[PDB]
Design a protein around this ligand. Sequence first.
Ligand SMILES: *[C@@H]1O[C@H](CO)[C@@H](O[C@@H]2O[C@H](CO)[C@@H](O[C@@H]3O[C@H](CO[C@H]4O[C@H](CO[C@H]5O[C@H](CO)[C@@H](O)[C@H](O)[C@@H]5O)[C@@H](O)[C@H](O[C@H]5O[C@H](CO)[C@@H](O)[C@H](O)[C@@H]5O)[C@@H]4O)[C@@H](O)[C@H](O[C@H]4O[C@H](CO)[C@@H](O)[C@H](O)[C@@H]4O)[C@@H]3O)[C@H](O)[C@H]2NC(C)=O)[C@H](O)[C@H]1NC(C)=O
Ligand SMILES: *[C@@H]1O[C@H](CO)[C@@H](O[C@@H]2O[C@H](CO)[C@@H](O[C@@H]3O[C@H](CO)[C@@H](O)[C@H](O)[C@@H]3O)[C@H](O)[C@H]2NC(C)=O)[C@H](O)[C@H]1NC(C)=O
Ligand SMILES: *[C@@H]1O[C@H](CO)[C@@H](O)[C@H](O)[C@H]1NC(C)=O
Ligand SMILES: *[C@@H]1O[C@H](CO)[C@@H](O)[C@H](O)[C@H]1NC(C)=O
Lengths: 45, 223, 213, 101, 129, 129
Amino acid sequence: DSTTETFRPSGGDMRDNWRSELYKYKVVKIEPLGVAPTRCKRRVV
Amino acid sequence: EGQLVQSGAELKKPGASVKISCKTSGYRFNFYHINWIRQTAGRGPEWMGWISPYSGDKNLAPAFQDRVIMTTDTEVPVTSFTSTGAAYMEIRNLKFDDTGTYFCAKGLLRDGSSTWLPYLWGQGTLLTVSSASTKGPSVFPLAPGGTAALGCLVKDYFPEPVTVSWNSGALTSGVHTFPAVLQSSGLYSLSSVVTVPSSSLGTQTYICNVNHKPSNTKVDKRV
Amino acid sequence: SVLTQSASVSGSLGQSVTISCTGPNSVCCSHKSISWYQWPPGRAPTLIIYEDNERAPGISPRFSGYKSYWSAYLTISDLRPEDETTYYCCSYTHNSGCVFGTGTKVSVLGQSKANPSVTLFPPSSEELQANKATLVCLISDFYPGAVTVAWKADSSPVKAGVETTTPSKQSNNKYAASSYLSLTPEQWKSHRSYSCQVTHEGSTVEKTVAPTE
Amino acid sequence: ENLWVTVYYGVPVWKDAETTLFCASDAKAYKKHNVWATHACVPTDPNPQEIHLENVTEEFNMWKNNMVEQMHTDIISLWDQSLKPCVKLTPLCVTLQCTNV
Amino acid sequence: VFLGFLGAAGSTMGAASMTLTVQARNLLSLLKLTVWGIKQLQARVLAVERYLRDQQLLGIWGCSGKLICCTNVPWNSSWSNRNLSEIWDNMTWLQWDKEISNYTQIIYGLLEESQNQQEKNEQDLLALD
Amino acid sequence: VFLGFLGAAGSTMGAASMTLTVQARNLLSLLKLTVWGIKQLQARVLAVERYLRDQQLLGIWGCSGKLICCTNVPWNSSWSNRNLSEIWDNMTWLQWDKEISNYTQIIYGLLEESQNQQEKNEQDLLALD
Ligand SMILES: *[C@@H]1O[C@H](CO)[C@@H](O[C@@H]2O[C@H](CO)[C@@H](O[C@@H]3O[C@H](CO[C@H]4O[C@H](CO[C@H]5O[C@H](CO)[C@@H](O)[C@H](O)[C@@H]5O)[C@@H](O)[C@H](O[C@H]5O[C@H](CO)[C@@H](O)[C@H](O)[C@@H]5O)[C@@H]4O)[C@@H](O)[C@H](O[C@H]4O[C@H](CO)[C@@H](O)[C@H](O)[C@@H]4O)[C@@H]3O)[C@H](O)[C@H]2NC(C)=O)[C@H](O)[C@H]1NC(C)=O
Ligand SMILES: *[C@@H]1O[C@H](CO)[C@@H](O[C@@H]2O[C@H](CO)[C@@H](O[C@@H]3O[C@H](CO)[C@@H](O)[C@H](O)[C@@H]3O)[C@H](O)[C@H]2NC(C)=O)[C@H](O)[C@H]1NC(C)=O
Ligand SMILES: *[C@@H]1O[C@H](CO)[C@@H](O)[C@H](O)[C@H]1NC(C)=O
Ligand SMILES: *[C@@H]1O[C@H](CO)[C@@H](O)[C@H](O)[C@H]1NC(C)=O
């Protein structure tokens, strides 16, 4: 009944070791194509 | 698409100081100036100043440059594009003519020729400056197409404001709350009435809930 | 304030109306931008116009701005009942805060007439015990927004303890007001009836209570 | 008042994605052949560039990170790559008769 | 004033549009069968594959040489109703790309068809004399 | 009106010349040592290699950005004697490429030399003042 809490060590998975150093990083891809509206028009020439 | 919620109304004596808060949500608090504007009966609406949550730069009008202190807290992120924040204004050397309604307001644009322009406003905070003490209200019942009207009378309270709800907020349709009266004694009084079908006497009980937070008094009156 | 607006302006229903905003050259026009705000009394305002012509997001195309070298103007087209309120202009630059105007109250003519609603409540038995006596006359849903209230003790005028509020605008763009008459329990019991008379230029309504019933 | 679409090439826009990362280690010189550095990992740039992104707020989740899953399979695969050429002790399963020390 | 790669990712679209060169530069630049070698070579092929795809789109939109190009496609209001000041001085390219990511494919199709496939035939019939 | 990739392969050259965008789009877009992995990676490198070669020719002909470009090279009649109506309204690009595949290499050489190698030096001497 939440009166006492017990903590034991373990090593269930080896990945937890990598997460200890990859918690701050993240991979994303750059999408450099953006389309926006402006008061510009192409010259028909 | 965010809401600014200001602290409740306060009654303070002249010469004292008061600190009003303005909690924000639904947008990036860091990206927009927070303006402070007040409205009094003697001077009308009056802009006091703004402050930038990002840089901390503040700009106060000369009339409040020596009596207003503006501060802001750091934003607590919720998502990548929204967060929650809080801005404060501390005004000192209060006078009787400083009694009025105070607003905080979010700026318009992050960049441009009018970035700080107050665009999103809070609900307002009523500040009363008086040497008189707080006084709780006295609530009296207002006795009652097949339609009828009943309500509750809030007599002799101070200061403003007083809030009235029905059935703990369950009854909102047909409610009509009237502005307060300013007696010659300096105390306020208002009335609230609700219109209901006359046949609904055997199925509906109407409870008016009066809250006067300045006196920290609640009254639940059965009509 | 040094920024002056037209104190009052009127326009007809379905028509347009223009509000002016001018002042000295120190605080007016060139070298400055002008914004407009809708500010109903007792409620939070709404930004309609900033940087001259350019209207705030979601603002109806009925609103338009125009700035001359000496004064600025705000035009409201296709007038609605909700357009009847108070409006303020502001003069500002990028680094300098707002300078508010003197204010303008807009009246919309050509609106339908609204009959006054009058209700009079007597003092409660708990109130006669206090012992005081206050009659409450509540008025709502009248238009235009102007009333005059008179109290009578046994068909004869009263002048002691009369308090009447200013007219106030309802959420339905009609107006409301209230009046209170404070009395002593002897005056209340010593008369055959009391009356609240609400007078309007088109029709006068009378509501009467009596201590007997 | 007439608006038209215009193409911008180089807008700071990114989306969550999982790609194949590679190795990079300083120029440590020497005995060698340490499994992880391998014969060749791209030498780290003499000066790395860490560019702070002002005003940016990104959601992280170290538990759904795919860098972990990739690194895990890289260590495992690196181990096997180093055991393949070494001597296999298949004949060392002869019956052993052992005594105390 | 240079902040670095993706420095203006949290700035307004107008401010970010000034440093598009920054993103353009860093956008492309016995047995070798090691796990690293296979990853590296496959990574290098992936980088040039993404770069050539974006340059391909700029090619079929007649915007190959430029970072900022104007088109003939009018801005249909169903995509976004925001005014210029609200778009360029109140939004970042990230939250913009999220608001318009829905209609991007339709916009890309109109961008290759409406002008450069019409523009080139009319250019031949115009310089025909 | 879109038929799809190579849809106008049997149409007249004039009709096919209208949908060049269609061919332009779909023209480029523990151990990974599997037979498929080696084939895929080698296939991907082959695709970008062919694309960059055609874009290289458009570059040295000064036609990089466009699908339709006009040149300065006059049409030598020895290549084909057919009139415009007979070429563009009676032949398909397939049978055209077969009739001119013989002189394509000569034409490509004149296309890179005659204009863009002469055009660029004259462009410097013209904008020289
Ligand atoms: C990340 O996000 C944040 C938040 O979204 C964003 O910060 C905003 O950035 C924009 C643009 O950079 C800001 O908008 C601009 O603000 C300029 C600064 O306002 C000036 O005025 C202040 C008041 O000055 C009065 O008061 C002082 C006393 O305090 C008095 O002495 C003065 O005489 C005057 O009366 C002033 O405090 C402020 O000072 C700051 O800025 C200067 C640099 O300019 C710095 O040196 C100081 O130390 C101090 O930090 C400042 O001087 C304003 O000038 C500007 O208006 C001009 O430029 C626009 C173009 O943008 C023109 O169109 C216009 O016509 C003017 O010429 C514009 O308003 C905004 O205020 C920031 N804060 C917000 C939005 O909350 C970051 O930029 C983002 N960064 C990234 C990397 O993404
Ligand atoms: C593990 O067991 C082996 C037996 O298979 C032990 O090897 C033997 O150890 C004895 C010591 O008790 C050695 O005796 C010495 O032999 C040398 C021979 O040159 C002699 O010069 C000495 O005077 C002494 O007699 C014996 O040689 C040695 N046998 C072999 C084949 O090496 C070993 O010591 C045991 N080790 C442990 C840790 O138990
Ligand atoms: C994006 O498009 C989907 C499908 O039409 C829609 O359900 C969603 O609400 C849209 N969200 C945007 C664009 O904000
Ligand atoms: C193509 O060229 C070859 C060699 O000149 C010639 O023999 C053949 O007849 C030609 N065929 C064509 C172009 O129809």
